[PDB]
Amino acid sequence: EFNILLATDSYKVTHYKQYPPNTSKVYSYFECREKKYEETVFYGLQYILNKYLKGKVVTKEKIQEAKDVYKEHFQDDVFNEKGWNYILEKYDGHLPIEIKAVPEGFVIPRGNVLFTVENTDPECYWLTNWIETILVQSWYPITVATNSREQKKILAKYLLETSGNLDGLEYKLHDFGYRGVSSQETAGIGASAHLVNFKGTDTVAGLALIKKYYGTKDPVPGYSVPAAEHSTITAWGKDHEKDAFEHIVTQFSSVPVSVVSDSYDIYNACEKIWGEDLRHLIVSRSTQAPLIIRPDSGNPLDTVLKVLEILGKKFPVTENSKGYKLLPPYLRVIQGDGVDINTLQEIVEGMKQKMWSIENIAFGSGGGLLQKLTRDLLNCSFKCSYVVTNGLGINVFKDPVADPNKRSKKGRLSLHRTPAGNFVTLEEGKGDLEEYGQDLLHTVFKNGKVTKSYSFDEIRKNAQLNIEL
Amino acid sequence: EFNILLATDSYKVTHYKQYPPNTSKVYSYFECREKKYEETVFYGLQYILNKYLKGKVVTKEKIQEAKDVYKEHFQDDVFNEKGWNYILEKYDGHLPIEIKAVPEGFVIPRGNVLFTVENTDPECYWLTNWIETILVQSWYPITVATNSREQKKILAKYLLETSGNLDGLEYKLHDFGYRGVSSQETAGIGASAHLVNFKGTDTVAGLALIKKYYGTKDPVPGYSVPAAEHSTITAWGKDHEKDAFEHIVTQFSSVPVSVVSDSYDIYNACEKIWGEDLRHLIVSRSTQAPLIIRPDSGNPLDTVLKVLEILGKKFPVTENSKGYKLLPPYLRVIQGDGVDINTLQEIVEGMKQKMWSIENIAFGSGGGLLQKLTRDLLNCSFKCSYVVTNGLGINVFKDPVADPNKRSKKGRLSLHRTPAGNFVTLEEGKGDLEEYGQDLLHTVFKNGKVTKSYSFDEIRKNAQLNIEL
Ligand SMILES: O=C(Nc1ccc([N+](=O)[O-])cc1)C1CC1
Ligand SMILES: O=C(Nc1ccc([N+](=O)[O-])cc1)C1CC1
Numbered sequence: 001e002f003n004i005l006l007a008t009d010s011y012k013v014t015h016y017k018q019y020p021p022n023t024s025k026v027y028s029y030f031e032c033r034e035k036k037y038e039e040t041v042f043y044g045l046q047y048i049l050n051k052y053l054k055g056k057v058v059t060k061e062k063i064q065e066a067k068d069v070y071k072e073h074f075q076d077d078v079f080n081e082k083g084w085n086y087i088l089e090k091y092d093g094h095l096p097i098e099i100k101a102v103p104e105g106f107v108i109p110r111g112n113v114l115f116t117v118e119n120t121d122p123e124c125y126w127l128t129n130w131i132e133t134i135l136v137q138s139w140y141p142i143t144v145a146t147n148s149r150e151q152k153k154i155l156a157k158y159l160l161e162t163s164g165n166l167d168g169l170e171y172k173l174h175d176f177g178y179r180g181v182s183s184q185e186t187a188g189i190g191a192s193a194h195l196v197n198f199k200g201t202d203t204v205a206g207l208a209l210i211k212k213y214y215g216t217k218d219p220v221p222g223y224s225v226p227a228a229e230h231s232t233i234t235a236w237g238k239d240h241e242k243d244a245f246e247h248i249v250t251q252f253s254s255v256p257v258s259v260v261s262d263s264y265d266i267y268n269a270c271e272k273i274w275g276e277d278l279r280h281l282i283v284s285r286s287t288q289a290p291l292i293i294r295p296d297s298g299n300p301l302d303t304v305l306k307v308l309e310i311l312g313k314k315f316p317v318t319e320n321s322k323g324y325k326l327l328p329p330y331l332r333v334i335q336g337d338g339v340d341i342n343t344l345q346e347i348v349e350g351m352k353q354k355m356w357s358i359e360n361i362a363f364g365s366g367g368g369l370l371q372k373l374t375r376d377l378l379n380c381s382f383k384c385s386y387v388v389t390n391g392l393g394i395n396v397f398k399d400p401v402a403d404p405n406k407r408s409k410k411g412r413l414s415l416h417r418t419p420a421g422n423f424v425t426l427e428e429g430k431g432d433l434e435e436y437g438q439d440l441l442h443t444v445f446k447n448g449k450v451t452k453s454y455s456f457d458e459i460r461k462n463a464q465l466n467i468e469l
Numbered sequence: 470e471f472n473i474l475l476a477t478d479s480y481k482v483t484h485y486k487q488y489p490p491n492t493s494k495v496y497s498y499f500e501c502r503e504k505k506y507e508e509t510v511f512y513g514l515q516y517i518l519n520k521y522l523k524g525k526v527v528t529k530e531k532i533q534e535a536k537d538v539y540k541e542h543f544q545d546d547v548f549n550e551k552g553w554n555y556i557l558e559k560y561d562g563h564l565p566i567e568i569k570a571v572p573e574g575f576v577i578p579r580g581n582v583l584f585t586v587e588n589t590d591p592e593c594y595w596l597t598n599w600i601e602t603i604l605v606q607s608w609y610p611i612t613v614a615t616n617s618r619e620q621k622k623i624l625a626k627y628l629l630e631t632s633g634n635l636d637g638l639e640y641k642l643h644d645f646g647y648r649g650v651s652s653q654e655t656a657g658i659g660a661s662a663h664l665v666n667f668k669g670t671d672t673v674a675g676l677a678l679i680k681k682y683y684g685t686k687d688p689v690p691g692y693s694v695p696a697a698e699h700s701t702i703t704a705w706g707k708d709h710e711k712d713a714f715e716h717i718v719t720q721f722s723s724v725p726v727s728v729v730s731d732s733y734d735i736y737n738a739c740e741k742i743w744g745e746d747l748r749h750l751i752v753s754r755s756t757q758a759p760l761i762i763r764p765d766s767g768n769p770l771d772t773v774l775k776v777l778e779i780l781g782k783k784f785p786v787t788e789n790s791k792g793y794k795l796l797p798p799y800l801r802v803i804q805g806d807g808v809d810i811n812t813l814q815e816i817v818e819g820m821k822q823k824m825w826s827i828e829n830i831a832f833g834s835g836g837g838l839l840q841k842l843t844r845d846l847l848n849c850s851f852k853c854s855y856v857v858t859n860g861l862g863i864n865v866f867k868d869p870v871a872d873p874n875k876r877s878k879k880g881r882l883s884l885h886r887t888p889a890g891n892f893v894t895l896e897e898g899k900g901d902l903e904e905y906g907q908d909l910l911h912t913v914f915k916n917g918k919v920t921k922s923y924s925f926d927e928i929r930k931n932a933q934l935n936i937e938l
Contacts, residue, residue: 002653009647010671010693011727017720018701020713026704052653069676072688076724078695129700133648140651178478179602179851180844182609184471184521185654202479207538219541224479226547230877231598231853232487234865235495244489251486255545258480265870298871367843374836375649382648384700396703401734402767408699 004057004095005066005084008133013070016080016126024122025388028129029413031425032142033379034111035405040378041149041463042106042114043196044141046453047189047213049099049445052134056448058084058093086123094448096121097128099135100441102415104454105196105462107149110378113413113425113441117382120447125387132382139380140186143373144193148173149463151341151365152197155358156467158348162324162357166468173344173363174200174224176336177370190370195221195456196463203370214456221456226251227258227294234263242273249281249291258292258334266295270307275314283315285330292362296337301350304335308356324357336364340372383408385427395428414439473526474535474553477602482539485549485595493591494857497598498882500894501611502848503580504874509847510618510932511575511583512665513610513658515922516682518568518914521603525917527553527562555592563917565590566600569910571884573923574665574931576618579847581894582882582910586851589916594856601851608849609655612842613662617642618932620810620834621666625936627817628827631793635937642813642832643669643693645805646839659839664690664925665932669831672839683925690925695720696727696763703732711742718750718760727761727803735764739776744783752784756798761831765806770819773804777825793826805833809841852877854896864897883908 019026032040063084070079087093101115102108117135119128155172159165175194181187184205191206192214201207201222210221228248236244241264248259261269270293274282282291293311295303311327318326327333335347344365348358375381384396385408395411414431416439418424424436431439444452488495501509532553539548556562570584571577586604588596624641628634644663650656653674660675661683670676670691679690697717705713710733717728730738743751743762751760762780764772780796787795796802804816813834817827844850853865854877864880883900886909887893893905900908913921923931 006673006677007653008673009645010673011696011698014695014721015698015701017695018697018713018717020705020709020716023704026700028700069673069689073673073676073692074694074724075692078724129698134653136648137650137652139649176478179605180608181606181651181655182840183606183652183654183658184476184603185652186650189652204475204477204479204538204542207542208475220538223542223544225543226483226486227480228487229480229484229598230867231495231497232484234867235488235492235853235856235858237863237865244487247489248487252483255543262869262871263867267870297869297875303871367845371651371843374840376836384704387704389704394706396700396706398699398703398732400731400766401736402731402772406766 002052003062003065004052005062006069007052008130010073012130012133013074014078015129016083017078019125020389023125023387023389024391025119025386026125026128026384027116027118027386027412028132028382028384029113029116029409030135030138030380030382031113031409032110033381033405037110037146037150037378039107039109040142041145041196042102042108042142043104043145043193043459043463044138044189045101045115045444046104047141047209048134048138049450050213053095053131053445054448054450056093057095058088060088063088080126083123083126091448095127096124096447097131097445098443098447099445101444102440103442103462105459107463108423111425112423113409113415116413116441129384136375136380136382139375139378140373141189141193142380143378144190144370145196145463146378147341147373148194148197148369149465151344153465154341154345154348156465158352159358160467162322162352163320163359164322170199171362173198173365174336175203175206175369176364176366178203178205180367181370187370194369196459199223210456214454214459216456225256225258228260230260230263233260238264241269242277245273245278246281249278253289254286255289256292257289258294260294260296262296266297266303267306267310270310271314275310279314282331283328287329290330290332292332292334294334294336300335300338300343301347304333304347304361305350305354307333308351308360320357320359322357323355325355326357327360332362333360334362334364339363339365340368385409385413386411415441471521472531472534473521474531475538476521477599479542481599481602482543482549483547484598485552486547488594489858492594492856492858493860494588494855495594495597495853496585496587496855496881497601497851497853498582498585498878499604499607499849499851500582500878501579502850502874506579506615506619506847508576508578509611510614510665511571511577511611512573512614512662512928513607514570514584514913515573516610516658516678517604517607518919519682522564522600522914523917523919525562526564527557529557532557549595552593552595559590560917564596565593565916566596566914567912567916568914570913571910572931574928576932577892581892582878582884585882585910598853605849605851608844608847609842610658610662611849612846613659613839614665614932615847616810616842617663617666617838620813622934623814623817624827625934627821629936631791631821631826632789632828633791637828639668640831642667642834643805644672644675644838645833645835647672647674649836650839656839663838665928668692679925683923683928685925694725694727697729699729699732702729707733710738711746714742715747715750718747722758723755724758725761726758727763729763729765731765735766735772736775736779739779740783744779748783751799752797754799759799759801761801761803763803763805769804769807769812770816773802773816773830774819774823776802777820777829789826789828791826792824794824795826796829801831802829803831803833808832808834809837854878855881884910
């Protein structure tokens with residue numbers, strides 16, 4: 001069973017001894033610190049609140065277990081047993097903490113307060129930053145949602161330019177990252193964040209997370225279709241690739257089907273196998289059940305373009321109203337190797353240059369989508385900005401001489417709409433002057449209870465692109 | 470509760486329909502594919518086997534849930550209910566799978582077989598690659614362990630060169646990554662992998678993982694010391710940084726204590742606060758309880774060197790037997806910002822150039838240690854190499870025309886010692902010719918049981934540096 005007393009950075013165990021004496025309040029905030037990725041999607045806090053922070057999270061057994069571990073870990077007795085005892089006795093083990101946050105799904109420019117944390121009982125001044133470690137891991141669903149949305153923007157721009165609309169946009173980037181992330185839990189969280197922006201996923205863990213913690217009106221938030229892997233092609237033997245292809249498209253003759261085509265020679269597979277030997281099984285397929293040819297190696301741009309050129313000469317191509325070339329509806333292509341935000345951009349720009357509509361292609365992304373991201377990317381960061389000592393509130397901050405980018409905000413914070421409709425974070429408790437509208441942060445957690453929740457449907461709505469609006 | 474029927478990539482749900490008819494065996498293998506990082510530490514499979522794969526992993530309820538989810542996910546009924554029911558009924562839900570693996574902790578050159586997987590019941594031919602996704606997540610602990618060991622190699626070389634010994638090596642790279650990883654589960658796995666090589670960690674989650682799945686003779690596998698963070702310094706107020714320092718080092722006067730010193734002006738803190746105002750509290754400390762000064766911003770190399778030059782002029786410096794400068798034993802430095810394998814190398818080399826012993830410094834690493842890694846780094850990969858169809862075994866492989874680096878191995882594999890004492894992987898069942906002695910892989914999982922296991926102490930022993938040996 002999870003033990004919040006063992007879910008912090010070791011050194012925080014010692015911090016209760018280091019704050020100024022007579023400190024009754026410690027107030028901290030999270031931002032994606034300023035100084036590409038100019039705005040971030042706030043998503044994932046609700047998962048953390050519900051899974052780890054709510055309810056009776058302190059018990060006698062958990063305190064003793066923590067005491068036992070820390071004794072050995074530090075080779076010394078430092079550990080605030082009395083402080084944790086207090087929470088257990090006075091609050092039945094519920095955390096005397098208040099968290100206020102911008103609504104999930106909201107898209108906020110860098111350098112704004114996204115949530116704040118403070119103790120609600122003076123005895124628990126040390127608790128605010130105890131939970132920094134667990135709360136800061138919200139960086140991951142924020143960053144996955146944000147990077148996924150930025151890719152959607154690229155896809156939308158090029159799809160609109162080359163086709164004149166956005167049909168199918170929400171299926172143009174599929175999550176292939178299940179095997180490529182660091183754990184089962186990470187897979188579920190990351191997959192859920194991608195689904196804020198798209199509907200295609202193979203990372204099944206995401207579905208159950210959304211249902212349990214957020215919820216959708218639809219049965220599931222994400223979808224997939226039958227597809228081959230190299231094992232299901234290569235198992236037929238090197239000389240029987242055609243047989244494998246035929247068996248697979250025939251098994252799935254009435255649904256869309258993706259077939260990896262690069263086991264031996266992608267260009268041969270497209271020109272001679274699909275384009276000649278098995279052409280009769282492709283041209284007969286429904287518009288709702290195309291063959292999706294999947295290259296999986298080589299330079300992503302070069303391979304995509306060469307695959308399109310080969311297919312364009314074996315299959316009947318039209319030119320759409322924008323002047324771009326379009327494969328017949330029963331045939332499409334997906335590139336799912338080496339795709340990240342950089343290579344996605346290069347591929348669609350290259351296609352546009354060669355007069356191929358983005359209607360022709362879809363993408364899959366694995367490591368690039370769910371693993372190749374860090375907390376540094378959006379500078380997701382949690383800092384103390386206000387304390388009360390001897391009954392006096394003081395505005396606190398860091399401001400390292402050698403790195404102005406690491407300066408933190410001062411005092412009590414609030415998030416507001418500007419007169420032009422943008423966002424501003426007010427410092428030093430200036431929000432109390434009420435010269436702006438209402439504070440956009442809402443209490444989402446107080447004293448062990450989740451106080452405000454969002455469905456996944458609401459989150460999707462909040463994270464919509466402008467071009468969709 | 471975890472459901473293995475829901476812990477695979479979506480498309481694999483459809484693979485049982487795609488293999489050649491009458492396939493009785495699918496045999497697959499995992500390697501860190503060839504073409505820095507010339508050898509990898511094999512670590513983490515044992516966690517996966519015990520947490521996810523062993524015992525009764527299939528129930529009537531789990532089957533029904535998966536069926537209901539996939540119906541919606543695919544908008545069709547393609548889920549192999551009968552296949553999963555067979556396992557439930559025939560094997561009381563235990564997986565008829567045999568896995569053979571190299572010993573955990575082993576250090577093996579790239580491009581060798583590390584583990585193999587095959588079904589033990591011909592009806593379960595589809596099961597081998599169903600569990601690809603979960604087994605391939607072993608990439609993460611392998612890669613963290615490997616990259617952590619590569620950093621140890623660097624620290625060893627320079628510590629040995631500048632000091633004449635390796636005293637304290639195992640505490641020279643501390644895990645600061647808890648907040649910077651993508652999940653709680655990832656934190657535990659990654660921290661455990663770092664502890665294969667070092668003994669310093671703040672990622673508490675790693676301790677319980679090791680205790681449950683591996684075990685040590687010692688009470689805990691990793692340790693920490695009291696340390697400040699920006700909040701426990703800045704909470705005192707901008708004008709009271711000296712007061713914060715004095716309070717903290719007085720509270721922790723008889724144990725080592727690390728104090729972040731860059732909240733406002735690192736160079737001032739070193740020269741004026743530590744070096745003058747509070748000097749009397751530092752020079753009085755025990756060799757067993759040094760002050761560890763922690764810069765945390767600026768160019769890592771430039772800041773480390775300037776911090777050392779400052780301290781060297783305020784405190785009594787000696788010259789060790791190797792001719793390098795050494796701070797007094799009550800004073801040390803730790804760099805814990807922007808440390809990864811590249812910058813670690815730059816710092817120790819720059820210190821050597823400026824005649825500072827590596828005895829003076831330790832490192833902390835967070836994102837660089839536990840998060841900024843992908844499956845692509847060591848090319849961790851799982852592929853089918855052998856199948857039996859209509860009673861005939863065939864050697865199978867991929868070999869993409871555009872990327873020779875993605876060619877996979879053929880047929881039944883085994884791992885052997887060469888006449889010179891190195892590793893070789895034999896393909897095509899050639900291990901059976903018995904010209905290369907015994908297979909070095911061991912059966913670690915068979916039919917729902919873990920059949921061979923390693924303590925964390927054994928793993929540490931296997932992973933030692935040659936220089937330590
Ligand atoms: O293509 C699909 N899934 C999939 C493909 C490749 C990987 N991978 O890891 O390379 C993982 C999953 C289905 C949407 C059609
Ligand atoms: O320095 C320590 N812990 C620690 C410091 C900084 C971070 N961080 O994330 O920045 C995390 C943990 C203790 C070993 C003394």
